[PDB]
Structures are given as C-alpha cells and as structure tokens.
Amino acid sequence: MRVVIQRVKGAILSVRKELEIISEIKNGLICFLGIHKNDTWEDALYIIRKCLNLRLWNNDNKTWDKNVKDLNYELLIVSQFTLFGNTKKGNKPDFHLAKEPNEALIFYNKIIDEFKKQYNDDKIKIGKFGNYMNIDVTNDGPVTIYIDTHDI
Amino acid sequence: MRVVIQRVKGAILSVRKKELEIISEIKNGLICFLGIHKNDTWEDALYIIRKCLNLRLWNNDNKTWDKNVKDLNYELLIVSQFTLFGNTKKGNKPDFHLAKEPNEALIFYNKIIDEFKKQYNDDKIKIGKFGNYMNIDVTNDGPVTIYIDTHDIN
Numbered sequence: 001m002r003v004v005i006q007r008v009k010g011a012i013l014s015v016r017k018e019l020e021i022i023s024e025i026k027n028g029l030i031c032f033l034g035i036h037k038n039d040t041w042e043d044a045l046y047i048i049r050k051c052l053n054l055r056l057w058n059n060d061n062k063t064w065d066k067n068v069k070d071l072n073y074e075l076l077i078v079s080q081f082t083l084f085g086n087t088k089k090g091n092k093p094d095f096h097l098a099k100e101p102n103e104a105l106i107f108y109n110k111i112i113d114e115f116k117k118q119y120n121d122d123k124i125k126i127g128k129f130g131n132y133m134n135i136d137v138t139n140d141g142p143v144t145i146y147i148d149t150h151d152i
Numbered sequence: 153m154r155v156v157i158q159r160v161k162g163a164i165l166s167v168r169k170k171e172l173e174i175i176s177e178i179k180n181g182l183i184c185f186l187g188i189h190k191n192d193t194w195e196d197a198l199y200i201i202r203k204c205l206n207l208r209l210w211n212n213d214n215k216t217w218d219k220n221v222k223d224l225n226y227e228l229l230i231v232s233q234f235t236l237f238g239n240t241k242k243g244n245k246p247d248f249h250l251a252k253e254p255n256e257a258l259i260f261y262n263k264i265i266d267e268f269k270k271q272y273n274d275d276k277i278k279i280g281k282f283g284n285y286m287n288i289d290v291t292n293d294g295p296v297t298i299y300i301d302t303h304d305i306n
C-alpha cells in the first residue's frame with residue numbers, strides 16, 4: 001500500500017451534482033491511499049497505524065510531537081489508484097499495479113472501518129470511491145509524508 | 153529525488169506577514185512537492201523535470217491520460233518538501249537525516265527551478281519561499297496524485 005499524507009488546516013470535498021460538497025474536515029490529515037494488487041490486511045494495518053500515530057504537529061517547545069488523535073483532529077481518506085501510475089516506460093501512465101476497483105473498494109471500506117475502530121468513528125471522513133472529486137485542501141506547512149508498505 | 157505531483161484547477165500560496173500574504177498562484181496545472189535527497193545528482197533532477205513537464209495527466213476528448221502540462225499551456229507550482237525524506241520506519245517521530253541539508257538543498261532547488269523555466273517557460277513556473285512556512289490552498293482535480301522516486305530509476 002502507498003499513502004501520501006498531507007497536514008491540513010482544512011479540506012472540503014465536492015462531487016459533480018455545478019459541484020456539491022459531500023465531505024469536510026478542519027485540522028488534521030488528508031490521506032491519499034493507493035491499494036496494491038497484492039496488498040494484505042497487514043499492509044492496511046501498517047498505513048492506518050502510521051496515519052493515526054505519526055507525530056506531525058508541533059506542541060510549542062516541541063516539534064513533531066503530537067499526532068491526529070492527540071489533538072482531536074480529523075482524517076479524510078481518499079482512494080488514489082494513480083499512486084501506482086507506472087511512469088517509467090513513457091509519458092502515458094498505466095495503472096496495472098493498482099488493485100482492481102471491485103476488490104479495491106472492499107479493501108478500502110475495511111480500512112475505513114478499522115480507522116474508525118482505532119480512533120473515533122466521527123473523525124474519519126471519506127470521499128466517493130471511484131467518482132470524480134474536487135478537493136480544496138488548505139495545506140499547513142506544507143507537510144507531506146510518503147509511506148510504501150513494500151519497503152517494510 | 154522524490155516528487156509528489158497533484159493535478160490542480162488552482163493553487164494559492166501564502167507566507168507569514170491579514171497575517172498571511174499571497175506570493176504565488178496558479179490556475180490549471182500541477183503542484184509538485186519536491187524532496188531532495190543527500191546524494192541527488194543533476195540526472196535525478198533532470199528526470200523529475202522531464203516527467204513533471206511531459207507526463208500526460210489530462211484527458212482530451214475521447215482520450216484519457218493524453219495531454220501534458222505543456223500541451224495545454226498550463227502552469228507548475230514547484231515547492232521544496234524535505235518531509236518526503238521523513239523516515240517513519242522507526243517510531244512515530246519522523247527522521248529527516250536523509251534529506252539534503254538546507255544550504256545545499258536551496259542551490260539545488262534553484263537550479264531545478266531554472267531548468268524548469270528553460271525547458272518550458274519562465275511565466276509558467278511558480279515557486280514558494282524556500283525554508284519558510286507556507287499556506288497552500290490547493291484545488292485538487294480528480295484528485296490525481298503521482299509519486300516518483302528517482303532512486304527506483306537507474
């Protein structure tokens with residue numbers, strides 16, 4: 001599994017209705033989550049644990065000290081198959097390394113459940129899987145973290 | 153080198169000093185969050201620029217993944233992001249030792265920006281404020297997030 005984690009002051013998620021807002025968070029994280037074809041539940045578990053526990057906020061005096069849970073902040077989890085974009089061949093990407101959309105959705109849904117189980121069910125916002133999304137992100141820093149579980 | 157590329161309808165970059173001040177802004181195009189590694193070479197930088205400018209990340213009529221940022225006269229906002237070399241394998245406090253140290257990172261970054269302008273056009277390349285806190289309002293389009301690590305390349 002691949003995840004891009006961005007530290008945000010807020011994120012507003014819209015779909016085409018011109019656009020209607022379905023999701024919104026204030027301070028916290030937007031997590032762009034790529035699901036590999038070979039991902040197991042242990043790959044999911046690692047990403048979840050890292051997203052929830054990574055110490056990405058300062059606590060004056062201390063840098064990199066508080067996580068999303070510590071500060072009662074929110075997470076928006078967005079599925080991003082493009083994170084397996086093969087950009088090595090030419091300039092046209094292909095995405096064959098990403099999990100096929102049906103088994104990806106189920107896996108994703110299980111991840112959201114576990115996010116809610118490990119943190120709080122009110123603090124976990126989502127997009128519309130598969131659908132086109134407009135997301136206004138207020139990047140705080142910016143702070144961008146990347147994790148690939150196949151490096152673990 | 154590491155880069156996170158996001159397809160945008162717009163991005164608005166502010167810095168400190170009502171309390172925030174807008175310094176850069178693009179419409180359609182890419183925000184590229186760029187991480188510079190300790191041992192990055194000009195060849196790593198060249199690969200990043202080539203891909204950012206030439207990756208076909210936009211639709212065109214009946215065709216998907218067909219047009220690149222240059223094809224559409226779109227813009228690039230290039231932001232230095234050392235946090236991309238944040239090691240998180242050992243505990244939950246990130247370790248950034250593998251990121252090129254600031255002074256060397258800044259000159260390498262500015263060289264990269266110069267080459268972007270040379271390979272595309274000056275007026276289409278936007279930047280932030282290196283080593284400074286930034287507030288970046290990004291309108292993600294899709295979203296479409298691309299990740300490239302040049303170490304994976306030979």
Ligand SMILES: Nc1ncnc2c1ncn2[C@@H]1O[C@H](COP(=O)(O)OP(=O)(O)O)[C@@H](O)[C@H]1O
Nearest residue numbers: 081094095096097098099100101104130216217
């Ligand atoms: N894992 C995936 N999840 C969602 N969409 C995908 C995925 N893989 C490919 N796509 C989309 O489907 C289209 C066709 O891909 P596919 O039929 O899998 O292979 P190919 O491009 O070689 O025919 C692409 O334009 C891409 O946007």
